[PDB]
Design a protein around this ligand. Structure first.
Ligand SMILES: Nc1nc2c(ncn2[C@@H]2O[C@H](COP(=O)(O)OP(=O)(O)CP(=O)(O)O)[C@@H](O)[C@H]2O)c(=O)[nH]1
Ligand SMILES: [Mg+2]
Ligand SMILES: [Mg+2]
Ligand SMILES: [Mg+2]
Ligand SMILES: [Mg+2]
Ligand SMILES: [Mg+2]
Ligand SMILES: [Mg+2]
Ligand SMILES: [Mg+2]
Ligand SMILES: [Mg+2]
Ligand SMILES: [Mg+2]
Ligand SMILES: [Mg+2]
Ligand SMILES: [Mg+2]
Ligand SMILES: [Mg+2]
Ligand SMILES: [Mg+2]
Ligand SMILES: [Mg+2]
Ligand SMILES: [Mg+2]
Ligand SMILES: [Mg+2]
Ligand SMILES: [Mg+2]
Ligand SMILES: [Mg+2]
Ligand SMILES: [Mg+2]
Ligand SMILES: [Mg+2]
Ligand SMILES: [Mg+2]
Ligand SMILES: [Mg+2]
Ligand SMILES: [Mg+2]
Ligand SMILES: [Mg+2]
Ligand SMILES: [Mg+2]
Ligand SMILES: [Mg+2]
Ligand SMILES: [Mg+2]
Ligand SMILES: [Mg+2]
Ligand SMILES: [Mg+2]
Lengths: 56, 205, 81, 145
RNA sequence: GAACUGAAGAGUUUGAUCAUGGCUCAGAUUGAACGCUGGCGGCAGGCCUAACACAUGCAAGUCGAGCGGAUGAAGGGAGCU
RNA sequence: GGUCCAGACUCCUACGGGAGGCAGCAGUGGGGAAUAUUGGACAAUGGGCGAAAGCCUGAUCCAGCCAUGCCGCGUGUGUGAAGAAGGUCUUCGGAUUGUAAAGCACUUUAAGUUGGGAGGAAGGGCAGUAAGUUAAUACCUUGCUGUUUUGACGUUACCAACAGAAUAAGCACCGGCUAACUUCGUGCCAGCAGCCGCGGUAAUACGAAGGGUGCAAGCGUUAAUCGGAAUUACUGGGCGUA
């Protein structure tokens, strides 16, 4: 979605949007990247989750 | 999976020949095959009935190079079939494609015949098979692909299978490397040292 | 009404068909009245492509059963041979 | 294809991470441990068998004794992901982002409400901002975030 | 011609023994969960708990050859252009 | 996935006044030890309507995710004694890891790249001809003939070529039951444990290390059912003192 609802399909280089589809709630300051490779993204996220639990 | 590692500690632990090298040089003059592997090798350690049954099953499995789950499947099929499962298990083990390729002299050992079969170099009924479990039936004609007929491996394997004993149940056509499976070899065609009664006893518990 | 149609069995990308006489408002693979043969889209080797009971098929067609399009074509092909 | 007697020394492929013990380094070098420590007594500050040694000096001492040294990454997934994700060409201009900061009641919400004509300061619990707000507006000149 | 073919025990009460008797173990199965580890394929399976509450899309329509009406193509042309 | 009434609960509102029912397919919160994608097509088999093209179809056919299960295949093959170097134990003689490694020489399955390539397809439109129906070489129905047209899956199954050993092994256990043993630390501690039981200064039982034994893309633990249990005894037990 864009600012005032009305869902859109693309988002340009400096447009704030609301994305819907993550598994958990992130925290502010985290950066997002488009991976375009399902397996790589999933395994990297699992590795990051393990490191997060360990550091906690 | 597959057992890949030192293929001679198995002979020492089982205490029999248990062919795993090519048999070219010897067995005694490679490993001093009179002691169990490991630090505690000189100890004898007489073992119990369950130990004897386990050793017999392990010896058969390591001879034919199959893992435990496939072996349980073989046992279940032998029990299902008619006529004395004890030698039914051997009938069924002696019909695998890798074992048949080994008996025909195309490979030096079972591992090398598995290498040949898995790498798409064998045709059974004029068409390629690469499963080292294909139960060949009586009357099939195991051959070698024409693009794979000039490998040296087959040359040494044939010239060394020339002297190990006459199988007398497969006819190998040496000049062009084509075989024939007349029938399954009966119990009297194999070595009379395996006590398959121990295997049947072990699984019936 | 009462129809004659194909019930699908077999497995993924390997279809097998039973020629079944069913009340039309049943599931494709649900309850039926009678099976009158089969059809094999792949066959090959010793497998037969299709087999039908002539007697049962004629009896059910005489009782007012409407075959599907495939059942009509396959039944006329079987009657041809 | 029989036995050919080896002539020269023995060379291995030592693998080193972020840190390593001297004992482990000697083990991957197929040399006695006490030798390696001795080799430190002849070159700078010595070490002990069990002391945790770094990666740079580990690679240096492994290459000094004629061995092929290949190291590993402690977090190789991140470098593998980052490497094959950032490669592009082309460049275009973009609308600027701007933030508005100040003291409590100096009027930073009212300025944005005039620029956008949105009157959001009328709401808001307590008449204060407690959330960061991000807007994309078409001003009289161009687009601004 | 076939539709079967099939049945193991051990540890532990006593100084030692036999019996009685409980406990425990060796097997086969899960719609399984957890820990460590992890290459590929084929065929299957996947809210067992809250018949708890539900944002948003889709899941049942068709017939102009049953009937008025209004939408009114291409064309034949007619005039002026 | 219709109507009416009543009720509980959410919501709209311009405050006058209305709406809702995922135990359909995706999806969310919540509960939990724990169970997946806002996917594609109606090409196939079915269902509704139509006369017939055809329209509809989260049924269905397929794709996505997860070692959840079953099955199959890989992680190489032969030779190789200075029985290399290191590790471990030692009666200090040596033994073992071990043909294991290195060296030498072979092979390319699966995965990677390139190029070929079925089967799932029956039918539909048009055109012609021949029979039947009449009253009729009409319309229409039916055989056949010619032409044109259809596949989500899909970069399909499968096949051929290239490169290199190259890209791929862990888990539990080793006192008896029950296959597999020694050294070093610790000293009724720290700990282990299914049952007997281990640990108080030489621990094959705790924790490591060498070695070994089982399985193996899995291996263990927990939970649950039957078995062993003839321990509810119909098959098939007992009651003098258990
Ligand atoms: N007279 C006058 N009053 C102003 C002006 N700008 C803001 N105000 C007044 O100041 C008050 C607070 O302004 P506001 O914009 O809420 O300040 P703020 O910095 O956003 C509050 P916070 O720092 O918590 O986000 C408002 O009531 C507004 O009327 C101005 O230019 N002139
Ligand atoms: Mg397996
Ligand atoms: Mg403000
Ligand atoms: Mg105030
Ligand atoms: Mg006692
Ligand atoms: Mg439920
Ligand atoms: Mg509903
Ligand atoms: Mg749902
Ligand atoms: Mg409900
Ligand atoms: Mg929860
Ligand atoms: Mg789960
Ligand atoms: Mg359809
Ligand atoms: Mg229409
Ligand atoms: Mg629709
Ligand atoms: Mg759809
Ligand atoms: Mg799998
Ligand atoms: Mg798991
Ligand atoms: Mg040594
Ligand atoms: Mg086709
Ligand atoms: Mg023992
Ligand atoms: Mg001690
Ligand atoms: Mg113990
Ligand atoms: Mg221990
Ligand atoms: Mg249990
Ligand atoms: Mg009972
Ligand atoms: Mg029990
Ligand atoms: Mg009785
Ligand atoms: Mg009794
Ligand atoms: Mg009494
Ligand atoms: Mg008494």
């Amino acid at each position: 979605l864009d600012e005032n609802g009305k869902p859109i399909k693309e988002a340009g280089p400096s447009i704030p949007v609301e994305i819907l589809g993550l598994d958990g709630t992130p925290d502010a300051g985290d950066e997002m990247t488009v991976v375009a490779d399902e397996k790589k993204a999933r395994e990297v996220a699992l590795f990051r989750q393990g490191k997060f639990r360990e550091v906690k | 999976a597959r057992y890949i590692g030192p293929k001679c500690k198995l002979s020492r632990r089982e205490g029999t020949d248990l062919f795993l090298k090519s048999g070219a040089r010897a067995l005694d003059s490679k490993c001093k095959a009179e002691n169990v592997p490991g630090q505690h090798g000189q100890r004898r350690g007489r073992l119990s009935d369950y130990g004897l049954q386990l050793r017999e099953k392990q010896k058969v499995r390591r001879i034919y190079g199959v893992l435990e789950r496939q072996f349980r499947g073989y046992y279940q099929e032998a029990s299902r079939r008619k006529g004395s499962t004890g030698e039914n298990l051997l009938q069924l083990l002696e019909c695998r494609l890798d074992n048949v390729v080994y008996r025909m002299g195309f490979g030096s050992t079972r591992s090398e015949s598995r290498q040949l079969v898995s790498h798409k170099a064998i045709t059974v009924n004029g068409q390629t098979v690469n499963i080292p479990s294909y139960q060949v039936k009586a009357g099939d004609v195991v051959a070698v692909r024409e693009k794979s007929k000039n490998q040296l491996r087959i040359a040494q394997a044939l010239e060394l299978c020339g002297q190990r004993g006459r199988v007398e149940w497969v006819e190998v056509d040496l000049d062009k490397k084509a075989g024939t499976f007349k029938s399954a070899p009966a119990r009297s065609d194999l070595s009379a040292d395996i006590n398959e009664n121990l295997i049947v006893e072990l699984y019936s518990k | 009404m009462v129809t004659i149609r194909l019930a699908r069995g077999g497995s993924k990308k390997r279809p097998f068909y039973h020629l079944t006489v069913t009340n039309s408002r049943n599931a494709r693979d649900g309850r039926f009245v009678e099976r009158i043969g089969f059809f094999n889209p792949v066959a090959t080797g010793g497998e037969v492509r299709l087999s039908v009971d002539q007697e049962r098929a004629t009896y059910w067609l005489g009782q007012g059963a409407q075959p599907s399009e495939r059942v009509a074509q396959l039944l006329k092909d079987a009657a041809k041979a | 294809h029989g036995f050919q007697n080896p002539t020269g020394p023995i060379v291995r492929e030592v693998n080193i991470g972020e840190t390593i013990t001297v004992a482990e380094l000697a083990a991957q070098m197929s040399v006695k441990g006490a030798e390696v420590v001795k080799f430190m007594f002849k070159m700078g500050s010595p070490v002990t068998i069990n002391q945790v040694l770094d990666q740079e000096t580990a690679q240096l001492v492994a290459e000094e004794l004629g061995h092929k040294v290949k190291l590993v990454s402690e977090n190789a997934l991140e470098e593998q992901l980052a490497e094959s994700l950032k490669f592009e060409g082309e460049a275009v201009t973009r609308a600027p982002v701007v933030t508005v900061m100040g003291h409590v009641d100096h009027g930073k919400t009212s300025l944005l409400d005039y620029i956008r004509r949105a009157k959001v300061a009328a709401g808001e619990a307590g008449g204060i901002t407690q959330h960061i707000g991000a807007y994309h507006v078409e001003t009289e000149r161009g687009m601004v975030t």
